[PDB]
C-alpha cells in the first residue's frame, strides 16, 4: 500500500488528509479528483459555503528539501506530502499537521 498525504489551507489553518492506495499507486489526476471531493466535503462539514478547487499543486522532495511542481505520476512516492493551492485564497506558510484519514470524506 502507498500512502499519500494531501494538505491545503482552510480559513488560515492547514488541513492534512491521508489516502491509501494499492501497491501500484495513484495517478496525479486521480489524486487531485479524490482530494477535490474530500476537501469539498470537509469545507461543508466545517460550515464553509465556498467550493474547494485546485489551481496549483506541489509535492515535497525529501532529497532536496524543496517543494516541486506536481506534474508527473512518478513524483508520487510512498509517504509523499502534497500541497494544493487554491484560487481566491491568502496562503500564508504554517505548519502542516498530522493527517486525518481522507477516505471517510470520499462521498
Amino acid at each position: 500500500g502507498i500512502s499519500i498525504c494531501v494538505a491545503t489551507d482552510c480559513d488560515g489553518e492547514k488541513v492534512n488528509l491521508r489516502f491509501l492506495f494499492d501497491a501500484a499507486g495513484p495517478s496525479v489526476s486521480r489524486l487531485l479528483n479524490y482530494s477535490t471531493t474530500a476537501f469539498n466535503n470537509y469545507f461543508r462539514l466545517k460550515g464553509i459555503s465556498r467550493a474547494f478547487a485546485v489551481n496549483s499543486a506541489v509535492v515535497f522532495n525529501d532529497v532536496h528539501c524543496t517543494w516541486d511542481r506536481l506534474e508527473r505520476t512518478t513524483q508520487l512516492l510512498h509517504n509523499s506530502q502534497v500541497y494544493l493551492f487554491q484560487p481566491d485564497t491568502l496562503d500564508i506558510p504554517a505548519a502542516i499537521p498530522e493527517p486525518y484519514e481522507g477516505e471517510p470524506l470520499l462521498s
Binding site: 517543494w67 500541497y83 506558510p93 505548519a95
Partner: peptide
C-alpha cells in the same frame, strides 16, 4: 514538521 509552501 513541514511548513506549507508559498507560491
Amino acid at each position: 514538521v513541514l511548513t506549507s509552501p508559498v507560491p
